[PDB]
């Protein structure tokens, strides 16, 4: 709200660093069942509820 508390801010920083696609080299491992970042977030689609 541009007057934010630090506890509110620290959870933005964790959500910012999770806002990424999956790395390209994890496609290449052995027995990779993981395909896409299925916990991907967006500010438009889903509010993160503080």
């Amino acid at each position: 709200a541009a007057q934010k508390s630090f506890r509110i801010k620290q959870k933005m920083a964790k959500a910012k660093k999770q806002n990424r696609p999956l790395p390209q080299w994890i496609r290449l491992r052995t027995n990779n069942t993981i395909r896409y970042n299925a916990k991907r977030r967006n500010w438009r689609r889903t509010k993160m509820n503080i």
Binding site: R20, P21, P23, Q24, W25, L28
Partner: protein, 67 residues
């Protein structure tokens, strides 16, 4: 000729919407202006003489381009 210059001035100005562009900030092309001064009757011999570490997190894992 007085009706033509008035008819010529209608398509030029359009003052009510924006502006007329300043002649000082713009520049001429030698071009048309020697054609215009020929119609006034001045000779153009004299004025011709003056003309004469980014670290992409996707692809820093695999180095070779084939992979």
């Amino acid at each position: 000729r007085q009706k033509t210059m008035i008819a010529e001035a209608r398509n030029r100005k359009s003052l009510k919407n924006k502006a007329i562009m300043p002649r000082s900030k713009l520049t001429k092309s030698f071009g048309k202006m020697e054609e215009h001064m020929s119609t006034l009757g001045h000779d153009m011999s004299a004025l011709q003489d003056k003309q004469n570490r980014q670290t992409d997190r996707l692809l820093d894992g695999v180095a070779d381009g084939s992979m």
